[PDB]
Design a protein around this ligand. Structure first.
Ligand code: HEM
Ligand code: HEM
Ligand SMILES: CNCc1cc(F)c(F)c(-c2cc(C)cc(N)n2)c1
Ligand SMILES: CNCc1cc(F)c(F)c(-c2cc(C)cc(N)n2)c1
Ligand SMILES: C[C@H](O)[C@H](O)[C@H]1CNc2nc(N)[nH]c(=O)c2N1
Ligand SMILES: C[C@H](O)[C@H](O)[C@H]1CNc2nc(N)[nH]c(=O)c2N1
Ligand SMILES: [Cl-]
Ligand SMILES: [Cl-]
Ligand SMILES: [Gd+3]
Ligand SMILES: [Gd+3]
Ligand SMILES: [Gd+3]
Ligand SMILES: [Zn+2]
Lengths: 401, 401
């Protein structure tokens, strides 16, 4: 009933007792495991009781005056309005907990250092844009990156949602050709097609920053050109491969997910963009070397004069490491915050032991915590993990179309 | 039926075979335990009945006279003895199916090409030794490795099991040290001690081949030295790092797993060693670079004059790539079969396509199929998989001591 979990590098055994609390059931059964799949009126009071109970136990305040009192006020708000409002401190507490509960996030050692911008008093896309622009400039901070989330108004029935239509606040364009293939990032062909559709003049480039499609309740979206001085980018160069600069590769400083739904206490915020800083394999391995992404691996190998005629030269492996070195070197030279996959996973091990002591476990998704290069060279590879869903949470949600 | 996506190509399939998963696994809708390493005549009848059905399907005779006659035969044999005997052809098919069904094997494109030695008439630990030497001789084949399995007598009532105490036929001793360290392979410290206390005179190298501890029913295990000329090994050298040879590193040619149980139609064979050939990462990454194994990573990196002072130099990634290059070059120089992780995962994608057409799916453990370096550079990273248990099957079993 309490999973026994082992670390094979050291031999140590822990029990995940926190797992016994898991709520929104996952996709696995005793008959088949689906852990490797990416995407697997008044029950509101149940989720509310539990979250407010969480909040007060966290501040050493269970069964106290402010606790029972706040419980009645949510009872009364829902009774009269069919919903409720979070106290500002609860909204701050819920955002940090959801980050803390994200099983696929390797950077949760940072979960208590998060800046929350309360945008629950927002109306119209033009207003979101200034909220978003303030987030970006605050989080970017001339390259000394700072974790932030901007929380736009919660969801109510009979009224449409606030939504950011881009998956991230900074994405590069993907344009097709006289032959189907894509100039730019193929991960964003859809939203590039939607932006151009809504009256944006495309570029001719591999690294064109897309505009933003912001949508206010029960209204169509609006394009917004991001201020170019607010979008910090890093040209990629290699410390010793002089020709790497000539490949013309770049990436942006701020990873800011703008398509996930934040759920606290039974309330749902479909517009809540959050940002941290990059782990270097995200850029150098997934974004630039994935076959369906920029797919540069062979081009770098030719420049390195590697033998691409046989897979057993490990030319792929060699080129991939140099691309990752170039990312780290370039961000450091730009003085933009970035973390390598060894340093991050080592910190995640530290986080796991923190969370064992504090909460008796930590939901973690082994396939997402283990980096996409050098997996067994990092300590998380040899750590057995337990994956489950706790609330507050970040959840995926359908594209708003 | 679980919908399964490949993210490199965008294609989608449904794993209908999963609906037939017999014995149950460790996951629930509450929590996923996929990353854990170790997750009555009437019941024997119904397993037996299912396997026979499988066998007669495969030979295009489902529903025949011989089919029903064999069912009847199996029932009368269970009624009168509490067990039954496999026919030889049924045993060959059961052993191939067990390999086919093994979710953590990336080499299963080869599943139909397997040599089955029927040792079920084996009488003692001395005969068992002779059968094993013959297996090693045939499978090694002077470096042109051939996949094989030798099946010793089945678990049956009134008698104990045949057991091979060694986890593989070829293993290097691990000697706990003066200062509490280990000389040789730390994975084999337990079995090394057992050999010594059963009369083996230890060596004190890092690559001392262990004797075999072979157990006949209701007999203490018996010690057997492998004839040196039967154990093919490969000294490790690097194609361009000439000091690499001075590490004195070696590995053996034949990976022959000997401590697993083969189950076929409810019959259990606690001794049925099987062998194929190596994928280079097993040796170059896990066996040599795991911190709890040979753990050579930092010594190579220093020798390469990498900057081992900061993780952002990626010295670990670079040293590990050259260790894998050395393993591949060395085996190819010695003319000993080996497959690199790029070719292996590519042939596994073809296996998944073959199996999707043949059975409607394929049991696959993503965390074990994706190689421990350069994960997302291989195509199995971008393929979603369903993990489940089919019979016939190789199972883990407790060590007999
Ligand atoms: C501060 C440094 C941070 C680092 C280094 C980091 C790293 C990562 C990485 C590598 C992933 C895997 C994503 C992928 O490969 O697609 C991830 C996922 C995730 N991160 Fe973090 N992150 C950071 C900050 C944050 C913050 C501030 C939040 C929320 C406030 C957050 C929430 C999440 C969530 C919810 C996921 C799961 C997304 C999904 O399921 O697709 N992260 N993170
Ligand atoms: C011929 C080439 C073969 C290759 C390249 C290959 C490759 C692999 C690899 C890389 C693993 C993962 C091992 C680990 O990381 O611990 C594995 C596991 C496994 N293989 Fe294969 N293999 C081959 C032949 C065979 C044969 C002939 C059999 C049985 C007749 C077999 C049955 C299994 C089983 C049962 C496992 C899982 C072992 C466990 O769960 O601990 N393999 N294989
Ligand atoms: C190739 N990764 C793309 C990707 C997908 C996601 F779903 C993420 F959540 C993040 C992400 C988010 C944050 C806040 C920090 C960070 N380092 N990454 C990145
Ligand atoms: C670091 N791997 C150790 C290991 C553990 C296992 F459980 C295996 F089954 C194999 C294995 C077995 C066969 C027949 C071929 C092959 N290439 N590997 C290897
Ligand atoms: C098919 C597989 O589940 C899918 O590609 C997952 C695996 N693990 C991952 N891990 C991270 N961090 N990011 C990803 O996109 C993926 N992709
Ligand atoms: C704890 C973790 O599950 C463990 O180290 C697993 C991960 N994936 C693996 N994959 C393979 N092929 N072999 C292994 O031994 C492991 N070990
Ligand atoms: Cl990204
Ligand atoms: Cl091995
Ligand atoms: Gd030149
Ligand atoms: Gd030289
Ligand atoms: Gd020395
Ligand atoms: Zn699972």
């Amino acid at each position: 009933k309490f999973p026994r979990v082992k670390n094979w590098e050291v031999g140590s055994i822990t029990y995940d007792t926190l797992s016994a609390q898991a709520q929104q059931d996952g996709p696995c059964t005793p008959r088949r495991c689906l852990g490797s799949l990416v995407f697997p009126p008044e029950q509101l009071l149940s989720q509310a009781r539990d979250f407010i109970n969480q909040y007060y136990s966290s501040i050493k305040r269970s069964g106290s005056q402010a606790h029972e009192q706040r419980l009645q006020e949510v009872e009364a708000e829902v009774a009269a309005t069919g919903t409720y409002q979070l106290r500002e401190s609860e909204l701050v507490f819920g955002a940090k907990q959801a980050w803390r509960n994200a099983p696929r996030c390797v950077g949760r050692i940072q979960w208590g250092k998060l800046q929350v911008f309360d945008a629950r008093d927002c109306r119209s896309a033009q207003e979101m844009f200034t909220y978003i622009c303030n987030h970006i400039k605050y989080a970017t901070n001339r390259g000394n990156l700072r974790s932030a989330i901007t929380v736009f108004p919660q969801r109510c029935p009979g009224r449409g949602d606030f939504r950011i239509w881009n998956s991230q606040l900074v994405r590069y364009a993907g344009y097709r050709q006289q032959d189907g293939s894509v100039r730019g990032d193929p991960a964003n062909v859809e939203i590039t097609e939607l932006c151009i559709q809504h009256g944006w003049t495309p570029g001719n480039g591999r690294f064109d920053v897309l505009p933003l499609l912001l949508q206010a309740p029960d209204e169509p979206p609006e394009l917004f050109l991001l201020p170019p001085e607010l979008v910090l980018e890093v040209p990629l160069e290699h410390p010793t491969l002089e020709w790497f600069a000539a490949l013309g590769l770049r990436w942006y400083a701020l990873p800011a997910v703008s398509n996930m739904l934040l759920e606290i206490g039974g309330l749902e915020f479909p517009a809540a963009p959050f940002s941290g800083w990059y782990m270097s394999t995200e850029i150098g391995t997934r974004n630039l070397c994935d076959p369906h992404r920029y797919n540069i691996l062979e081009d770098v190998a030719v420049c390195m004069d590697l033998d691409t005629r046989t897979t057993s030269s490990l030319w792929k492996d060699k080129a991939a490491v140099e691309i990752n070195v170039a990312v780290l070197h370039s961000y450091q030279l730009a003085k933009v915050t970035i973390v390598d996959h060894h340093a991050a996973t080592a910190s995640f091990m530290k986080h796991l032991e923190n969370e064992q002591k504090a909460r008796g476990g930590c939901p973690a998704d082994w396939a997402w915590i283990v980096p996409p290069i050098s997996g067994s060279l990092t300590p998380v590879f040899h750590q057995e993990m337990v994956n489950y869903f706790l609330s507050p949470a970040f959840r995926y949600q359908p594209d708003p179309w």
